[PDB]
Design an enzyme around this catalytic site. Sequence first.
Site, short mmCIF file in Angstrom:
data_model
loop_
_atom_site.label_atom_id
_atom_site.label_comp_id
_atom_site.label_asym_id
_atom_site.label_seq_id
_atom_site.Cartn_x
_atom_site.Cartn_y
_atom_site.Cartn_z
N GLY A 205 34.21 47.75 42.99
CA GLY A 205 34.05 47.02 41.74
C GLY A 205 32.58 46.72 41.48
N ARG B 145 41.33 36.83 39.32
CA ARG B 145 40.50 38.01 39.56
C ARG B 145 39.57 37.80 40.75
NH1 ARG B 145 38.48 35.65 34.99
NH2 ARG B 145 36.44 34.65 35.25
N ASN B 146 39.36 36.53 41.12
CA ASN B 146 38.44 36.19 42.20
C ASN B 146 39.15 35.69 43.45
OD1 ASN B 146 36.08 34.97 39.73
ND2 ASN B 146 36.18 36.97 40.75
N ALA C 200 27.62 42.11 36.55
CA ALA C 200 26.24 41.66 36.43
C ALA C 200 25.68 41.38 37.82
CB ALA C 200 26.17 40.40 35.57
N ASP D 241 34.09 29.32 39.36
CA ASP D 241 34.56 30.61 38.85
C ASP D 241 35.94 30.98 39.39
OD1 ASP D 241 33.16 34.01 38.76
OD2 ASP D 241 34.35 32.89 37.30
N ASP E 96 33.55 34.67 46.08
CA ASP E 96 32.54 34.08 45.22
C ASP E 96 31.53 35.14 44.83
OD1 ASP E 96 30.53 32.37 44.04
OD2 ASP E 96 29.56 32.22 46.00
C1 LIG Z 1 40.75 41.76 39.93
C2 LIG Z 1 39.31 41.88 40.40
C3 LIG Z 1 38.94 43.26 40.95
O1 LIG Z 1 39.61 44.26 40.68
N1 LIG Z 1 37.80 43.31 41.77
C4 LIG Z 1 37.36 44.56 42.37
C5 LIG Z 1 36.27 44.16 43.37
C6 LIG Z 1 36.84 44.03 44.78
O2 LIG Z 1 35.89 43.50 45.73
C7 LIG Z 1 36.45 43.42 47.01
N2 LIG Z 1 37.51 44.23 47.34
C8 LIG Z 1 38.10 44.20 48.57
N3 LIG Z 1 39.19 45.08 48.83
C9 LIG Z 1 39.81 45.99 48.02
C10 LIG Z 1 39.56 46.36 46.67
N4 LIG Z 1 40.40 47.30 46.23
N5 LIG Z 1 41.18 47.54 47.29
C11 LIG Z 1 42.23 48.52 47.19
C12 LIG Z 1 40.87 46.78 48.39
N6 LIG Z 1 37.69 43.37 49.57
C13 LIG Z 1 36.63 42.56 49.23
N7 LIG Z 1 36.04 41.64 50.05
C14 LIG Z 1 35.02 41.01 49.38
C15 LIG Z 1 34.96 41.53 48.11
CL1 LIG Z 1 33.86 41.09 46.88
C16 LIG Z 1 35.96 42.52 47.99
C17 LIG Z 1 35.67 42.89 42.75
O3 LIG Z 1 34.77 43.32 41.72
C18 LIG Z 1 33.95 42.30 41.17
C19 LIG Z 1 36.91 42.20 42.15
#
Ligand SMILES: *CCC(=O)N1C[C@H](COc2nc(Nc3cnn(C)c3)nc3[nH]cc(Cl)c23)[C@@H](OC)C1
Length: 280
Positions: A18, A137-138, A21, A133, A151
């Site tokens: 993901g 989504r977080n 910003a 926040d 965060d």
């Molecule tokens: C709904 C919010 C979203 O989709 N985000 C994507 C990304 C994810 O950040 C992290 N992702 C994971 N694991 C993961 C993601 N997709 N799969 C299949 C597994 N683990 C994490 N540990 C810390 C963080 Cl940060 C993440 C974010 O983008 C802003 C939220």
Amino acid sequence: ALLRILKETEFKKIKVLGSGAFGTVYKGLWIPEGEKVKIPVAIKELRSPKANKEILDEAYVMASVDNPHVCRLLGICLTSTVQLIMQLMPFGCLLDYVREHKDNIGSQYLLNWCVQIAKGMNYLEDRRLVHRDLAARNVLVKTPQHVKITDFGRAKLLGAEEKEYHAEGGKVPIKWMALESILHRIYTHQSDVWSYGVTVWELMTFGSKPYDGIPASEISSILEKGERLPQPPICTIDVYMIMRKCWMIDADSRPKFRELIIEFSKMARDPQRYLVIQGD
Ligand SMILES: *CCC(=O)N1C[C@H](COc2nc(Nc3cnn(C)c3)nc3[nH]cc(Cl)c23)[C@@H](OC)C1
């Protein structure tokens, strides 16, 4: 939990998870120098730089946050960029998860998630950290049974004398914010509770959009008139009233996270009594 410093040779990016910003998050592999072990990690590479010492000191603070329902910072790499090495949550963000599995999610999981998010928020409050926040989504999914708050840079540590955080110019997630945050840029643990309430609403509606289609600019006016997000179909009134309590004008009339832990734990002991889901 302590902050260890990683060399670029220690970890590898594999895939983008993901971005925003704040920067970009990658699925990655961390191999601690000389430990011959592969550790799955999520690497956050952040977008005039601060001095390295300042960044590390902040990172030391972050790494000290050690709770089962807050995603942990494992290490940091400082090169041309700041890279934060965090725990990898296998199942992604909770918002996408509830949308994707809405047909197969029962009352037990939903209420357990509410308990766990409250537990993590309570831990942050003990640490004098206002999140600012909180939203589905977080929150991240370690397993369907276990979620963790994360965060992306909006969280603030309150000094010994500070009862609230007074915000500056940053962009704000209006539809998740307490009225006092929108109107006066004031954030507290109790404004996090408001956001917790909206987050719960997201979960209970299997990831529906709050104030759907309504411009963010009209939100303060709607709240000032006393309107709130509607009762979700699966919610008994008891559950909805907790949400409504999170959205009362007086921040100090809202429940505290410790109280929310107790309430939802009680419900989670008899989930089908409090959420009504077909085939559950
Ligand atoms: C709904 C919010 C979203 O989709 N985000 C994507 C990304 C994810 O950040 C992290 N992702 C994971 N694991 C993961 C993601 N997709 N799969 C299949 C597994 N683990 C994490 N540990 C810390 C963080 Cl940060 C993440 C974010 O983008 C802003 C939220």
